[PDB]
């Protein structure tokens, strides 16, 4: 432990900002003595041998709240000469030696990404995201954060880069695959609302490659359909939904999930006279499904869950509502 | 060795630590944590744990809300008791005695023991308010929390009336009611201190049946043993 000699540099670096704040009338001298003592206690806690990511986050939160306090006080005392750049630089320094000391803590990596995104640092955010993905490649949350922020920026090629490396790594759970199909169809909806893409064959290709993965269950394909069934206002949405249903019917013929997609298929983009027409079609499918030879307890639990989802909406007729209740109660 | 006697009295009357090993030992004395952990604890960790304890105590009873402002304050994280003057120290002693009278009823509970641990580890109540702390733990003299308080008490800081506790500090066992009652019949100071503590509580209406039964039993047995001592047969001596 050379921690005193190690923290001497960080205190001597933070000193001239305190000299500027003392030569302005923004912080008084007793308050600056308090800032000196608090930063000194924080540095000698941070550079200690036995340290913790919560200790690094407490120091980050204190420095960021000091920047916010000085911003409020500077706007109140009407000064424009004092800048926040030194505080952001030292907060980046705290975070860089934080991710040096504890690279295996995703809470601290995500706090670093939240800070770098919040003070408008996109290129630095991309570099931090690359380092975090290299250290935690099995983390679907980090991969979806990278891909969704690249899609939110609009660099769809970079979003596909992050997502295809993520689906190359995370193949135990379906989560990142579902999020990639969600992002690709959101790109398809953006390409539609801007008015290949005319076919929209990429989620069908995602399904065809996902057919051979170690998570490939009927529940996983039902999760694929439950992702796909949102935002039906598209062009090839009936093509995608019909391909999912014929895939599940050709592969898992008598599963309750396949009977559930047989129930809930024809209600794609409905909200309105086309609503109860397709509801009567789907209820015919549902009655045939309930009488048919399938695990009725599993199919009934699926249908009462979907019927709670149905009952969550207003603006319907009471006869339809009470016949949903009557068909619910005997399950 | 008259000079060694004068310096021993000065060192016993001194209150603040002046070398690093003394500061580390005085910071190590705690109720809850073992000493190896309690050395390396800043006053934010202790305040977080013991303020969770005081939040539980303030949700139990209503009348802890002034101590929420004066004793368990986020500014009271930082106040050093040995750097304030005599009147600030006396007002802090009044606030501590009021809290100890208030917390004596719930002292078997871990929230109240966490609150007393905050007072001990910040304001050093085991050194500066040994009388009121030892009196408010005396009705619970059969519990391991009293054994731990007896362990962390300084020896020369105990008042003269409670110096029967020295073999129970040398061997960490809880003292029995026979020892407390026998020292009450022998010393009038211990009986006066117990009765003064419970009457000063009962004037502030912070009584509880454990304290009332404790004082009633010990004054009954002490007056019993005191009459059996006072009986003499000679007329003027019995008068």
């Amino acid at each position: 432990a050379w921690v005193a000699d190690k923290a001497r540099f960080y205190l001597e670096r933070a000193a001239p900002e305190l000299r500027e704040w003392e030569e302005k009338e923004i912080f008084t001298k007793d308050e600056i003595r308090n800032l000196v003592a608090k930063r000194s206690d924080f540095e000698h806690l941070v550079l200690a041998p036995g340290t913790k990511p919560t200790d690094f986050l407490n120091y980050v939160n204190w420095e960021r709240s000091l920047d916010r306090l000085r911003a409020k006080r500077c706007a109140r005392l009407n000064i424009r000469s004092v800048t926040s750049h030194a505080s952001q630089a030292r907060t980046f320094g705290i975070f860089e030696r934080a991710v040096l000391k504890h690279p295996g803590s995703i809470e601290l990596w995500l706090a670093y990404l939240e800070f770098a995104a919040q003070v408008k640092a996109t290129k630095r955010w991309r570099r931090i995201m690359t380092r975090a993905l290299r250290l935690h490649p099995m983390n679907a949350s980090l991969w979806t954060l990278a891909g969704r922020r690249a899609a939110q920026n609009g660099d769809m090629q970079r979003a596909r880069a992050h997502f295809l490396r993520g689906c190359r790594f995370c193949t135990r759970e379906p989560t990142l695959w579902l999020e990639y199909a969600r992002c690709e169809m959101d790109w398809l909806a953006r390409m539609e609302a801007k008015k290949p893409a005319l076919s929209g064959a990429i989620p069908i290709a995602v399904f065809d490659v996902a057919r051979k993965q170690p998570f490939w269950g009927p529940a996983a394909a039902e999760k694929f359909f439950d992702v796909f069934a949102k935002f039906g206002h598209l062009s090839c949405h009936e093509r995608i939904i019909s391909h999912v249903v014929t895939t599940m019917q050709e592969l898992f013929p008598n599963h309750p999930c396949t009977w559930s997609v047989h129930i809930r298929q024809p209600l794609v983009g409905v909200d309105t006279p086309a609503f109860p027409k397709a509801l009567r079609e789907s209820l015919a499918r549902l009655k045939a499904a309930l009488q048919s030879t399938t695990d009725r307890k599993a199919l009934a639990t699926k249908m009462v869950a979907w019927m709670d989802g149905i009952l969550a909406i207003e603006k319907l007729d009471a006869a339809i509502r009470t016949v949903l209740e009557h068909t619910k109660r005997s399950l | 060795s008259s000079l060694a006697q004068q310096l021993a009295q000065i060192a016993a009357n001194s209150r603040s630590s002046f070398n690093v090993k003394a500061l580390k030992a005085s910071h190590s004395k705690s109720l809850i944590w073992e000493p190896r952990v309690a050395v390396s604890q800043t006053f934010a960790e202790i305040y977080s744990q013991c303020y969770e304890g005081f939040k539980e105590l303030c949700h139990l009873d209503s009348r802890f809300v002034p101590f929420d402002a004066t004793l368990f304050s986020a500014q009271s994280q930082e106040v050093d008791r040995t750097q304030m003057t005599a009147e600030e120290n006396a007002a802090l002693d009044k606030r501590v005695d009021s809290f100890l009278h208030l917390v004596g009823s719930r002292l078997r509970l871990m929230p109240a023991i966490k609150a007393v641990e905050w007072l001990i580890r910040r304001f050093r109540i085991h050194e500066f308010n040994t009388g009121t702390l030892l009196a408010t733990f005396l009705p619970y003299h059969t519990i391991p929390a009293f054994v731990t308080l007896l362990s962390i008490l300084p020896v020369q800081r105990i008042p003269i009336e409670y110096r029967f506790l020295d073999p129970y500090i040398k061997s960490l066992t809880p003292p029995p009611r026979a020892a407390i009652v026998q020292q009450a019949t022998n010393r009038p100071d211990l009986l006066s201190a117990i009765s003064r503590y419970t009457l000063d509580s009962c004037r502030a209406k912070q009584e509880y049946p454990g304290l009332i039964s404790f004082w009633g039993g010990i004054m009954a047995e002490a007056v019993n043993g005191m009459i059996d001592k006072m009986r003499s047969g000679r007329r003027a001596i019995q008068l």
Binding site: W62, L69, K72 | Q75, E88, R95
Partner: peptide, 27 residues
Amino acid sequence: AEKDAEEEELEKFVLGAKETFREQLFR
């Protein structure tokens, strides 16, 4: 007052509250 409540909360968190601790003591 000329101070926001969020500014006073940041002042009590960042800078310390020793003066109001002494004020809460002497009551």
